[PDB]
Structure 1
Amino acid sequence: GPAVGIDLGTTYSCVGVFQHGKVEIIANDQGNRTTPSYVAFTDTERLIGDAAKNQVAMNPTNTVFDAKRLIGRRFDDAVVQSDMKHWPFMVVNDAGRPKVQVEYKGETKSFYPEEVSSMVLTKMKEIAEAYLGKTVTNAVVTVPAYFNDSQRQATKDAGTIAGLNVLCIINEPTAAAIAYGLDKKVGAERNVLIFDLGGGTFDVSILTIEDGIFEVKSTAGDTHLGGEDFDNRMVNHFIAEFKRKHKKDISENKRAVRRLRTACERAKRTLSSSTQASIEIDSLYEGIDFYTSITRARFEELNADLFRGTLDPVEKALRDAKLDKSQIHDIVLVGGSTRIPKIQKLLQDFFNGKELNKSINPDEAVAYGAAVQAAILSGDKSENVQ
């Protein structure tokens, strides 16, 4: 029975398996090849993934996400203290350790970040088991290149709690490089830039690769810039719209705002392949149906600063690596947000028209690499050579 690769992402998770000579990125039972990193605790049940995210508006205080921001940290950590203001769920201090606190089956319960992440991993394991028709125990699990030993060990512990044996914890940008087979090349060292714009975080990594050996030369980015922020730019746009049309402000109604955000995220995805998108929400606020349209142009304008701003970390990573932009052998798009046409144009223009590696779905690339690596470490991907 094969080992699997799991991208345990801040906002979404993804599982792949190398079998019969090919990597399969595995669809969940709702048909989605990525699964929200969400966990909801209700009166009757514990919900994970699509079902958890889908009911966030009805149950905000007991639906946990962002556990990856807590994992491997102390409660007193400046990052934890700052992040806590953004979350509708409770975070408490247990002898120096952060714990999320929820209401569940009529009881107050708390969970360590690695426990929350174990529930996400458990779901990913089950997604793989459905597809393979057998139990999954071994996995490679990925993490950000900048994760420290504490964050890595906590990620491994999450696997153990999910009944997995973690064969290795590897870096996200390195997983993406492996998916493209970039570590199969021989000869002179080659420089690889990974441009990774996700749902919550933006990571630029420069790797040097020689004879299958990796070196992370530099890292740059913004841990608080992602697709969620593009969604919010749309949300504000439509709150204004609704207020002008109906003489009503939905801003202080949390349920309405979240339902609008859901619709905006869906429209955004549509705008990556079409030039316009329609939104339809039944009874958004005080009985009023909300219907509207938005163009790709208007979306891009609403986010113009945030998009062009992604180039600054590119510049920063380049100088820290002591490389000129012309010294980059490969550019790899990773993360759901890099499907945005304007982003791709912006980055390619920066690199003077140079071709971008994007043939592997950017939101699946990390899982894809993890899957390859898991097979290698299991003895299930021998080379032999002709």
Structure 2
Amino acid sequence: SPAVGIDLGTTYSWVGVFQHGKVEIIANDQGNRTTPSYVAFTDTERLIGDAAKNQVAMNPTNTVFDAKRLIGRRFDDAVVQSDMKHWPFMVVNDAGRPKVQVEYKGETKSFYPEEVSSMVLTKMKEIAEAYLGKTVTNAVVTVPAYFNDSQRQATKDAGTIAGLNVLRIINEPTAAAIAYGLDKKGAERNVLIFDLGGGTFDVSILTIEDGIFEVKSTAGDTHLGGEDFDNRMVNHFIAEFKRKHKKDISENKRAVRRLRTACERAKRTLSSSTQASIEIDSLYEGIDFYTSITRARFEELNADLFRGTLDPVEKALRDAKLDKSQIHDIVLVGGSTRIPKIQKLLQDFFNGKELNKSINPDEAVAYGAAVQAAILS
């Protein structure tokens, strides 16, 4: 039976299958290969993915995201209490365990983090069945290497709730290394995984000896990601709109959301183009917002965030007791590592060493998990 590899991402989720000697990162029936890790609840329906993300500004308190930051954790955990101040949805305590509380079809309902993630996994399952034309049951699901047993068990539980048979929970940096065949290359191999996603930055140093993976060190920032770079763009354009129209759009949640979406899309374009256009009809009080931004300006807006990603690299190397010259392979993971300045900074830091980046970095985890799922099935 087909077995799939699932990257259950903090902000975006991906599903691949290894067939015929190739990995297919599977598109949904609108052609999109990624599913935002969003679930929403309304008067009439439950919405997953982009359908949930697209109505977040009209339905903020019943639109849930970031379940991966809660999954496997206890309610009184410092990080849970810290994160809850930034979320517009309610997190309640059920007997020590955090639950998200929403209104759903006119009734108050609460869900464990793994139930929320299972709804995202249900969609991934359906996407893969739409592509394969067959029932999909077996899956390998990835987690951050620092996840503990509770978080791993809760992530497996989300798979089970979704109807998946989770063959194995494996680490995201190991999935990435597997995707590049780094366990099949010789002596010990020191591998640095540089994983910059939508909300989190993870650096891992693995050593692979006789095909055995050992996590030597991890570092990073749990609250640094692409959305911070989008944030800097949003603020930049809110200030521009105010300077040009003497109007502050900050308190119109729908306007800011439309600006944010435009900024995220401009950001992606700036990874392959030196400029990007912003085109928003009726952004605020009937005023269109047609403008542009250069790649240089985007880099300037974020210069300290980009440069600072090197400090967790240095720390991970110090903890692994390796010099930078002892790294055999550098692997780029997460959508944010497509940013040319981040690539330049990292390659410069490694004295010109070529990066592993031929696999779309935001897809490399699902790619590796798909390979592992075929091996185990």
TM-score normalised per structure 2: 0.99
Q: Deviations over 1:269-301 (max 9, x none)?
A: 000000001111122122222111100000000
**In the alignment, is the contact (CA less than 8 A) between 1:125 and 1:136 conserved in 2?**
yes
| Inter-partner Cα distance in structure 1 for 2:288 and 2:90 | 33
Residue aligning to 2:40:
40
Q: Deviations over 1:290-321 (max 9, x none)?
A: 11110000000000000000000000000000
Q: Report how many aligned residue pairs link the two structures.
A: 377
Partner SS for 2:93: strand
Q: Deviations over 1:327-361 (max 9, x none)?
A: 00000000000000000000000000000000000
Q: Deviations over 1:251-286 (max 9, x none)?
A: 122221111111100100000000001111122122
Q: Deviations over 1:181-222 (max 9, x none)?
A: 01112x211100000000000000000001110000000000
Instruction: Report the Cα offset of residue 61 of structure 1.
Output: 1.3
| Inter-partner Cα distance in structure 2 for 1:263 and 1:59 | 19
| Inter-partner Cα distance in structure 1 for 2:110 and 2:43 | 15
| Inter-partner Cα distance in structure 1 for 2:107 and 2:30 | 30
| Inter-partner Cα distance in structure 2 for 1:31 and 1:58 | 25
| Inter-partner Cα distance in structure 2 for 1:114 and 1:39 | 12
Greater mean alpha carbon deviation, residues 327-336 or residues 240-249: 240-249
Partner SS for 2:231: helix
Q: Deviations over 1:138-178 (max 9, x none)?
A: 10000000000110000010001000110000000000000
Q: Deviations over 1:217-270 (max 9, x none)?
A: 000000000000000000000110111111111112222111111110010000
| Inter-partner Cα distance in structure 2 for 1:77 and 1:160 | 25
Instruction: Report the Cα offset of residue 132 of structure 1.
Output: 0.3
Instruction: Report the Cα offset of residue 36 of structure 1.
Output: 0.4
| Inter-partner Cα distance in structure 2 for 1:304 and 1:265 | 17
| Inter-partner Cα distance in structure 2 for 1:65 and 1:195 | 24
**In the alignment, is the contact (CA less than 8 A) between 1:90 and 1:102 conserved in 2?**
yes
Greater mean alpha carbon deviation, residues 16-25 or residues 265-274: 16-25
Instruction: Report the Cα offset of residue 58 of structure 1.
Output: 1.7
Greater mean alpha carbon deviation, residues 334-343 or residues 53-62: 53-62
| Inter-partner Cα distance in structure 2 for 1:56 and 1:300 | 28
Residue aligning to 2:71:
71
Instruction: Report the Cα offset of residue 20 of structure 1.
Output: 1.4
| Inter-partner Cα distance in structure 1 for 2:188 and 2:30 | 43
Instruction: Report the Cα offset of residue 54 of structure 1.
Output: 1.7
Greater mean alpha carbon deviation, residues 255-264 or residues 306-315: 255-264
Greater mean alpha carbon deviation, residues 251-260 or residues 142-151: 251-260
**In the alignment, is the contact (CA less than 8 A) between 1:16 and 1:25 conserved in 2?**
yes
Instruction: Report the Cα offset of residue 9 of structure 1.
Output: 0.4
| Inter-partner Cα distance in structure 2 for 1:258 and 1:87 | 15
| Inter-partner Cα distance in structure 1 for 2:258 and 2:91 | 24
Instruction: Report the Cα offset of residue 2 of structure 1.
Output: 1.0
Partner SS for 2:361: coil
Greater mean alpha carbon deviation, residues 241-250 or residues 224-233: 241-250
Q: Deviations over 1:106-164 (max 9, x none)?
A: 11111000000000001111110000001111100000000001100000100010001
| Inter-partner Cα distance in structure 2 for 1:83 and 1:101 | 15
Partner SS for 2:5: strand
| Inter-partner Cα distance in structure 2 for 1:257 and 1:102 | 23
**In the alignment, is the contact (CA less than 8 A) between 1:45 and 1:105 conserved in 2?**
yes
| Inter-partner Cα distance in structure 2 for 1:252 and 1:57 | 12
Give structure 1 regions of 4+ aligned residues with deviation exceeding 3 angstroms: none
| Inter-partner Cα distance in structure 1 for 2:342 and 2:113 | 32
Partner SS for 2:292: strand
Q: Deviations over 1:80-108 (max 9, x none)?
A: 00001111111111111101111111111
Residue aligning to 1:383:
none
Partner SS for 1:252: coil
Residue aligning to 2:126:
126
TM-score normalised per structure 1: 0.96
| Inter-partner Cα distance in structure 2 for 1:292 and 1:43 | 37
| Superposition RMSD in Å | 1.4
Greater mean alpha carbon deviation, residues 357-366 or residues 40-49: 40-49
**In the alignment, is the contact (CA less than 8 A) between 1:57 and 1:259 conserved in 2?**
no
Partner SS for 1:363: helix
Residue aligning to 1:57:
57
| Inter-partner Cα distance in structure 1 for 2:69 and 2:29 | 27
| Inter-partner Cα distance in structure 2 for 1:5 and 1:136 | 11
Residue aligning to 1:25:
25
Instruction: Report the Cα offset of residue 32 of structure 1.
Output: 1.3
Greater mean alpha carbon deviation, residues 311-320 or residues 286-295: 286-295
Instruction: Report the Cα offset of residue 14 of structure 1.
Output: 0.3
Instruction: Report the Cα offset of residue 26 of structure 1.
Output: 0.4
Greater mean alpha carbon deviation, residues 249-258 or residues 15-24: 249-258
Q: How does 1:235-314 map to 2 (within 5 A)?
A: 235-314=234-313
| Inter-partner Cα distance in structure 2 for 1:30 and 1:194 | 31
Instruction: Report the Cα offset of residue 376 of structure 1.
Output: 0.5
Partner SS for 1:364: helix
